[PDB]
Structure formats: C-alpha cells, structure tokens
Design a protein around this ligand. Structure first.
Ligand code: CU
Length: 105
C-alpha cells in the first residue's frame, strides 16, 4: 500500500503531533487542495467546521482497495503517512465536489 494509517479512528485536533503537516477543512473546502510533501511524511487533515467531512481515495490509488477515511466531526483529525512518491487524488464521500490531491515527491 502506499500509505500507512496511524489511527483508524479520528482523534482530537489537540492530539495532532508536533511536526504535523496540517490541511484544514473549512467552508466546505480543503484549504490546501494541492499539497506537496515528501516520502515518509504524515499529512493530517483537521475538520474545522461542524459539517462532518472525510478524505476518500478510490480503489487503486493508495492500495488495491479504496481508502474511505472515517467521518471527522468538528475539531477532529485524521492522518495518513505516505510511503511512495506519486500524485494521489481524493474527495469527500458525502460532498464529492470537495476534491484535493497530495503530490508526494
Ligand atoms: Cu465533506
């Protein structure tokens, strides 16, 4: 698989690690819709609004199966550690017009 999941459950925004590469979600948008990180980096999305959101990668892009992350409520977070270079598109399952990508280099 090209990503590791540190926590299968969402966790509190206060529990996000110190060296965290944060993407905020607010106003029905991923605030950094094109993020560039390097191999081995953990990206953490934090939902800043009351409407629940997640990140969903379809099958074949991070692994054989789709990775449909858990719904994050307000001030909850979810992390993915990327282990292989490439461009990984994602969207929000209930809100497919919300789209972003992680370019791992
Ligand atoms: Cu959403």
């Amino acid at each position: 698989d090209k990503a590791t999941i540190p926590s299968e459950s969402p966790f509190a925004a206060a529990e996000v690690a110190d060296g965290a590469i944060v993407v905020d979600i607010a106003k029905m948008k991923y605030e950094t819709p094109e993020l560039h990180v390097k191999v081995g980096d953990t990206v953490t999305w934090i939902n800043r609004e009351a409407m629940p959101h997640n990140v969903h990668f379809v099958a074949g892009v991070l692994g054989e199966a789709a990775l449909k992350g858990p719904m994050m409520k307000k001030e909850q977070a979810y992390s993915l550690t990327f282990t292989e270079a490439g461009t990984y598109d994602y969207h929000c399952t209930p809100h497919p017009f919300m789209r972003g990508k992680v370019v791992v280099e």
